[PDB]
Structure 1
């Protein structure tokens, strides 16, 4: 069992490009945390750490601190012992609408927070939405995150990143684009996944027939026919091709389904 000072690395929680995340248990105190390990031999991590140190909100993963030990960086974060939203989505089914609604509220709270400190996540998807012991959602993984507002001045993005089934269509079609509507779009694909247990398209290019079908309002197809009319009216306002016409988070919060009592 590997270790870092007082911590035993006791279980793999993920292993992408950026090394691994380990469940770390302090041998003295028995405190459990998550540790991201990056082998710097294999600028970006300077940025990630700077962003992580800004984050203070109940629906965003907390940063405890980092240790360099040669080429290895250790990033200590809050453990979400519930695991991911990904694992609460039953393929082809989704989850009960009240659970989807609660998670969507928490995801909006997290995203409003990040946007309000001028940070865009840029890869919102169920893999990056983690659950604490009380099933409170946490936005995780700030490795693609970036500043879109500084000194109250917005900067457009030009870098293409994210995950194709979650990316907004402007990110495939425009030289430059606003950060906020991209994160809103991916929230709408997450909501679709939660209510239908299915992603609607490989990517929103109109070389993609499922995306054309949606633009032509063919909601008698999957995944849309699994979704009640109320949450579907919200998805009609989120999954809008023109990012200037797309609903903003203030207006999501006035949506009928958003405010519908459910249990």
Structure 2
């Protein structure tokens, strides 16, 4: 209802909703996210601000914004593929080669953000969308923040994200580095892709499955389903001390990351 028609609803969140919009003239589809500033103005000025810095094949495109009352309309690459979340069969996952391709594209997109000083802070399957050729795009920069500016890094302090995807250090430390928190969330995504379940409600000492993982009891029930090469990588990513945790440039040299699996 704004040059374009609002055809169907797409992701009815908390803020408002993402609707799929078609232009009646040119037939061209986009996603419009609708936030009613009445039902925050602050995190949304940061969302559009971050969006405008973004340009990458693995990040959802930002087209633009109008304000039409209280009503902000962010205009965004429609992804006809939906969420990665729906590609994961519960308890089983997906073919190893499909996970590897999606993990590569997740890595490209994270490398890019980090490169420009931006941490997403809430990477999970629900926020990874698939285009027409199944290419992964990181989506929703609503919790995104800047962690490097004029080449100085700032530690984060605010806790945010989604508990099963969060790194331990965000539960435990007053300040922590952004990058390792995104790497961790990437590991839980890999886990989800390869087993079809989440390892733990949260990475606390007070949580059994997490305790079990630090004790390397991988005979148990996310990990058993995985396979020794991708598991090896997961042992490097889901390391509790954020300093000893593998980094991306080192994920790119990992044996499974570089294992040939998948046809064109």
Pairwise TM-score range, normalised by the shorter structure:
over 0.9
Which residue pairs with 2:4 in the alignment?
7
Which residue pairs with 1:142 in the alignment?
141
Shift of 1:27: 1.0
Shift of 1:175: 0.2
Which residue pairs with 1:35 in the alignment?
32
Residues in 1 aligned to 2:76 and 2:104: alpha-carbon distance in whole angstroms: 23
Deviations 1:210-230 (A, max 9, x none): 000000000000100000100
Q: How many residues are paired up?
A: 259
Deviations 1:141-167 (A, max 9, x none): 000000000000000000000000000
Residues in 1 aligned to 2:220 and 2:184: alpha-carbon distance in whole angstroms: 20
Residues in 1 aligned to 2:188 and 2:222: alpha-carbon distance in whole angstroms: 11
Shift of 1:46: 0.9
Shift of 1:16: 1.3
Contact 1:48 1:145 in 2 (8 A): yes
Counterpart secondary structure, 1:49: helix
Shift of 1:44: 1.1
Contact 1:57 1:110 in 2 (8 A): yes
Counterpart secondary structure, 1:69: coil
Contact 1:148 1:157 in 2 (8 A): yes
Contact 1:61 1:78 in 2 (8 A): yes
Counterpart secondary structure, 1:22: strand
Which residue pairs with 1:103 in the alignment?
102
Deviations 1:170-194 (A, max 9, x none): 0000000000000000000000000
What's the TM-score once normalised by structure 2's chain length? 0.97
Residues in 2 aligned to 1:71 and 1:233: alpha-carbon distance in whole angstroms: 50
Shift of 1:110: 0.1
Deviations 1:6-32 (A, max 9, x none): 111111111112210000011111100
Shift of 1:5: 2.2
Deviations 1:197-238 (A, max 9, x none): 000000000100000000000000010000010000000000
Unmatched segments (≥5 aa) in structure 2: none
RMSD: 0.5
Deviations 1:102-146 (A, max 9, x none): 000000000000000000000000000000000000000000000
Contact 1:62 1:77 in 2 (8 A): yes
Residues in 1 aligned to 2:46 and 2:161: alpha-carbon distance in whole angstroms: 17
Which residue pairs with 2:84 in the alignment?
85
Counterpart secondary structure, 1:199: coil
Which residue pairs with 1:53 in the alignment?
52
Contact 1:6 1:28 in 2 (8 A): no
Residues in 1 aligned to 2:256 and 2:15: alpha-carbon distance in whole angstroms: 38
Shift of 1:69: 0.6
What's the TM-score once normalised by structure 1's chain length? 0.98
> 1:107-126 maps to which residues of 2 (within 5 A)?
107-126=106-125
Unmatched segments (≥5 aa) in structure 1: none
Counterpart secondary structure, 2:10: strand
Residues in 2 aligned to 1:137 and 1:28: alpha-carbon distance in whole angstroms: 29
